[PDB]
Paper text:
Bacteria harboring β-lactamase enzymes [E.C. 3.5.2.6] pose a significant threat to public health. These enzymes prevent β-lactam antibiotics from reaching their intended target, the penicillin binding proteins (PBPs). Sulbactam, tazobactam and clavulanic acid are mechanism-based inactivators as they share similarities with the β-lactam structure, the normal substrate for β-lactamases. Similar to a substrate, these inhibitors can, after acylation at catalytic residue S70, undergo several inhibitory reaction pathways including fragmentation in the active site and covalently cross-linking at S130.
Numbering used by the authors: 26 to 238, 240 to 252, 254 to 292
Write the structure that this text describes.
Amino acid sequence: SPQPLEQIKLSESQLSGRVGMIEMDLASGRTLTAWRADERFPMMSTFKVVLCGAVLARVDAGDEQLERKIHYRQQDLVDYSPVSEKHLADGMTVGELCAAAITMSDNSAANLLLATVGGPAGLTAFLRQIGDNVTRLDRWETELNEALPGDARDTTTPASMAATLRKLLTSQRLSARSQRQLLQWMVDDRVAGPLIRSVLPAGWFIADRTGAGERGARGIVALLGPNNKAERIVVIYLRDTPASMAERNQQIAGIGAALIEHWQR
Ligand SMILES: OC[C@H]1O[C@H](O[C@H]2[C@H](O)[C@@H](O)[C@H](OCCCCCCC3CCCCC3)O[C@@H]2CO)[C@H](O)[C@@H](O)[C@@H]1O
Ligand SMILES: *C(=O)/C=C/N[C@@H](C(=O)O)[C@](C)(COC(=O)CCCC(=O)O)S(=O)O
């Protein structure tokens, strides 16, 4: 592989789209690679990690319990609800909803949780409270994935998203147990986790949440590192490319390969 930045550039040339990327040490926040890190990108389903961070904050404050069962109706469901469709009769716990949102990208689960934190405005207020003044949620699932050009709704920047994920996982803003829970949800991703492991060299840790949207929007927020450690946050977004889903996946994987091959920086 070329160096990471050279590969990121190559991916833009090949996609005819914008890539936004940051590689950050999880423990310290050291930024190693940054490319369009201050430009806006649609979050897509990656917002689900911040959503569950807001849920966990409520749990820590005693205003929520992960055990609490929510009993929803079919009229409450949106597109792609693989877990939530199964539990119309018996409901799902708040924690089960988080797991379905993060590990399966269950959209109805994300919307039920969104309501509990005061909707998109409530989540945005949470982000401002942890000092993210850039990331914003404006819409519910599934409309938040629309990715219109020039539209600032439902966007983050690589730098903001990385800093916010670090705050949630490590800053002791969340309780120790809640930090551990958010991490485990990302470790348990079923959408991309097992596939990524299948192509990672032995010894490499992965945890992740992915997203996809219109106009080629694609993204991943991930923890990655050798020696089976979550050494770094890697955030990659793509926007405004006409490329196939397969090609977008391959280009992100190629950036990952360049990181792996040239890890010691
Ligand atoms: O010298 C480093 C390594 O080089 C190769 O590993 C390859 C691997 O065989 C390939 O499957 C992967 O593709 C990249 C797959 C990455 C998957 C997505 C990564 C995510 C992770 C977090 C966010 C960014 C994207 O590249 C690495 C590095 O060349 C060798 O196979 C391996 O034995 C060796 O230890
Ligand atoms: C979040 O990123 C959602 C992506 N698109 C979904 C949506 O708009 O609700 C779809 C329903 C596709 O969803 C999936 O394939 C699940 C995995 C999405 C992910 O990467 O997390 S839409 O039909 O594209």
